[PDB]
């Protein structure tokens, strides 16, 4: 499913993550924005093995079970694969894992370099939530 920036806004905002560890809603849209074009379906196949899934691209090696990544970790406790259907709920969870575990956004590379420097609110504009 590819999510319209308002749609994903309002189902992010149901699943808790405004002000998500200090993280306001707009990080969130942002981050998916750069991070997938807000396609659930999105995927990045690594060099080392490891696959980035769905709408916040969530790596393989740490997060989340595909049964082809070497030297992995599944501390999402999830098959990657329900990391690319159109409910966003495990996604959300497993992000607010990534969130806590890593004390920040800073996980998410495009996040890093597209939206954390920006007013974050933008991603809101027009929002019914």
Do not use: E, H, Y
């Given at each position: 499913k590819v999510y319209s920036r308002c749609e994903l806004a309002a189902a992010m905002k149901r699943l808790g993550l405004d002000n998500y560890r200090g993280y306001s809603l707009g990080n969130w849209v942002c981050a998916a924005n750069y991070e997938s074009?807000?396609?659930?379906?999105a995927t990045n196949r690594n060099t080392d093995g490891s696959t980035d899934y769905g709408i916040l691209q969530?790596?393989?090696?740490?997060?989340?079970?595909?049964?082809?990544?070497?030297?992995?970790?599944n501390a999402c406790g999830?098959?990657?694969?329900?990391?690319?259907?159109?409910?966003?709920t495990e996604a959300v969870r497993c992000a607010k894992r990534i969130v806590r575990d890593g004390n920040?956004?800073?996980?998410?590379v495009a996040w890093r370099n597209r939206?954390?420097?920006?007013?974050?609110?933008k991603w809101i504009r027009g929002c019914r939530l």
């Open positions: 074009g807000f396609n659930t379906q969530i790596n393989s090696r740490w997060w989340c079970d595909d049964g082809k990544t070497p030297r992995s970790k999830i098959r990657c694969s329900v990391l690319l259907r159109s409910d966003i920040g956004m800073n996980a998410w939206c954390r420097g920006t007013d974050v609110s």
